[PDB]
Amino acid sequence: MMYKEPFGVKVDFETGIIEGAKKSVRRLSDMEGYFVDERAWKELVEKEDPVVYEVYAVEQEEKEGDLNFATTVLYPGKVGKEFFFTKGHFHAKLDRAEVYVALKGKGGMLLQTPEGDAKWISMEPGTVVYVPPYWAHRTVNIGDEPFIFLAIYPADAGHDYGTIAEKGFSKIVIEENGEVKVVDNPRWKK
Amino acid sequence: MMYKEPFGVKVDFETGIIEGAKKSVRRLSDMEGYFVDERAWKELVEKEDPVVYEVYAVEQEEKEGDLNFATTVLYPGKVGKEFFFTKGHFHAKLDRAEVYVALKGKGGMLLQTPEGDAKWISMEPGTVVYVPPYWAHRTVNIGDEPFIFLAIYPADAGHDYGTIAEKGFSKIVIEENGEVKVVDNPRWKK
Ligand SMILES: O=C(O)[C@@H](O)[C@H](O)[C@H](O)COP(=O)(O)O
Ligand SMILES: O=C(O)[C@@H](O)[C@H](O)[C@H](O)COP(=O)(O)O
C-alpha cells in the first residue's frame, strides 16, 4: 500500500491565502435566489457584481476517516440590509461534522437542522466552532473588513447545496438602525 | 433524534488555553522509556520532574464522521540532547487522519508508518500540517518558549500508544553544537 505523503503548508492568517492551493471565487451573480431582497441583488449585480467570497481548499480522495481543510475570505457587503454570506449547505453524508477556526474580522455562523431549527454562533478571532452532525451551515460577515476562517471537515462528507438553494435558512442576519440583528426569515418556506 | 447543540469556544492563541476545557498534564515521570538517554531522564525526574506538555481537549461521543479538537502546550526543554516531545501514537482505527494548526513557538512533527519510515515537518505559526491515514505522529519543541498548536481529528480514531511506547520513533530530534538535528535513532528496534 501507499502511505500518503505528510506535508505542511503556510497559511497567512492576515489574508487567508493557503500557499499553492488555487482560489475558487463566488461572485454575487453566482447566488441568484439566495438573498431576501431580490431587486437589491439584481441591482448590485448590474452595478458591480462584487466578489462575495473566495475559498482555498486542500482536499483528499473521498475516503472514510480522512480530512479536508479550507480557508475562506468572506468579503464585507450587504444586499439591501442583508450581510454577505456563503451559499450554505448540508453534507451529502449528513452525519459528518466540521470544525471552524476564526482568524480575522467579525462574523458568525448560521446553522440549521433538517427540521428547520436554526442557531447563530458569533465568531471573532480565536473562536473555534463545532458544526455538529446533521446541521447545515452558512457563514456571515457582519463587519467592514474581510472575515477570514479555516475549516476542517471529513473527506467523504460531500455537499448538498440544493436544499438550501431552494428553501434558504429560517433566519437572516441584517443591519437596521446601525445595529446587527438576527431575525426570522420572512420568506422561509416550511 | 437529538440534534447536538452547536457551540463556539474561545481559544487563546497566546496561551493555548481552551475556555472551560480542563487541562490534562503529562510530566516527565509519565514518560519512562521514551527518551534515548535514560540516565538523563532519571536525573531530570529526580531534580525537577517538569511538565512536558498540557492538553485541552473537546471531544464527542465516539462515532463515525464526527470530530474532536484539542490544543497542546508543549514546554521547552531537553532530556540530554533530545528536545521535549509528546508521547506519540497511532490511531486505533489506523486509516484516520488529523489536521494540525501551529499557533505559537517553534517546533515540528515527526511521523512514522507501520513499516518504520519517518518524516519531519517543520512547524511555525500559521503552518497547517496534514497527518495522513496510517501514520503515527509526535510533536517536538525545538525552541526556548512554549510550542502551542491546535489539532482536529476524527471522534472514532482512538489511540495506540503502546506500539510507540515499546519501539519509539526511527528518528530523534536533538541539539548538538547549538544546531538542531534530525538523525537516526540509535536505539530503533527493527
Ligand atoms: O468547510 C466548509 O464548509 C467551507 O470551506 C465552505 O465550503 C466555504 O466557507 C464556502 O461556503 P459554501 O461551501 O457553503 O459555499
Ligand atoms: O490530536 C492529537 O493527537 C493531539 O491532541 C495529541 O493527543 C496531543 O498533542 C498530545 O500528544 P499524545 O497524545 O501523543 O501524548
- Three-state DSSP at A1 gives coil
Query: Which helix (H) or strand (E) segment is A46 a member of?
Result: helix A38-47
Cβ contact, residue pair A65, B121, below 8 Å:
no
Query: Rounded to 10 degrees, what is the CA torsion of B141, B85, B14, B155?
Result: 140
Sign for the CA dihedral angle at B7, B57, A13, A31 comes to negative
Establish whether B32 is an annotated binding residue: no
In the block, cell 544546531 appears at B179
- Three-state DSSP at A29 gives helix
Question: Could you tell me which residues are beta bridge partners of residue A107?
Answer: A123, A141
Architecture of the domain whose range is B3-190: Sandwich (2.60)
The two beta strands, A136-141 and A107-112, are antiparallel
Helix and strand numbers (H, E) in chain B are 2, 14
Residues recorded for chain A: 190
Backbone angles phi, psi at A20, to 5 degrees: 75, 10
Nearest atom within ligand 1 for CA of residue A139: 9
Q: Kindly state the cell numbers that stand for B4.
A: 447536538
Q: Does A2 touch chain B (CB under 8 A)?
A: no
End-to-end CA distance of chain B: 49
Out of B3, B119, B121, name the one closest to residue A113 (CB). Answer: B3
Distance A151 CA to ligand 1 centre (A): 8
Query: Hey, which bits of B6-146 come out as E strands?
Result: 7-10, 23-27, 51-58, 67-74, 78-79, 82-83, 98-104, 107-112, 118-123, 127-131, 136-141
| Number of neighbours of residue A62 by Cβ within 10 angstroms | 14
Sign for the CA dihedral angle at B141, B135, B55, B103 comes to positive
Cβ contact, residue pair A152, B152, below 8 Å:
yes
Q: Report resolution in angstroms.
A: 1.5
Contact A70, A150 (CB under 8 A): yes
Residue whose C-alpha is closest to residue B152's, from B58, B63, B74, B53: B58
Query: Which helix (H) or strand (E) segment is A44 a member of?
Result: helix A38-47
Backbone angles phi, psi at B46, to 5 degrees: -60, -40
Question: Could you tell me which residues are beta bridge partners of residue B139?
Answer: B109
Establish whether B159 is an annotated binding residue: no
Residue whose C-alpha is closest to residue B96's, from B123, B62, B119, B73: B62
| CA–CA separation, A91 and B18 (whole Å) | 27
| CA–CA separation, B36 and A68 (whole Å) | 36
Nearest atom within ligand 2 for CA of residue B100: 1
Residue whose C-alpha is closest to residue A165's, from A139, A189, A135: A189
Residue to mutate, A86, A103, A141, ligand 1, most ligand atoms under 8 Å from C-beta: A86
Q: Please report which ligand is nearest the Cα atom of B89.
A: 2
b/e per residue A127-164 (b: at least 16 CB within 10 A): bbbbbbbbbbbbbbbbeeebbbbbbbbbbbbeeeeeeb
The two beta strands, A7-10 and A118-123, are unpaired
| CA–CA separation, B24 and A33 (whole Å) | 48
B109 class by beta-carbon count within 10 Å (0-12 exposed, 13-18 middle, 19+ buried): buried
Residue whose C-alpha is closest to residue B98's, from B159, B148, B54: B159
Residue whose C-alpha is closest to residue A163's, from A103, A114, A95: A114
Question: Could you tell me which residues are beta bridge partners of residue A9?
Answer: B128
- Domain parsing of chain A, residue ranges: 3-190
Residue whose C-alpha is closest to residue B98's, from B12, B158, B176, B8: B158
* Resolved by: X-ray
| Number of neighbours of residue A69 by Cβ within 10 angstroms | 26
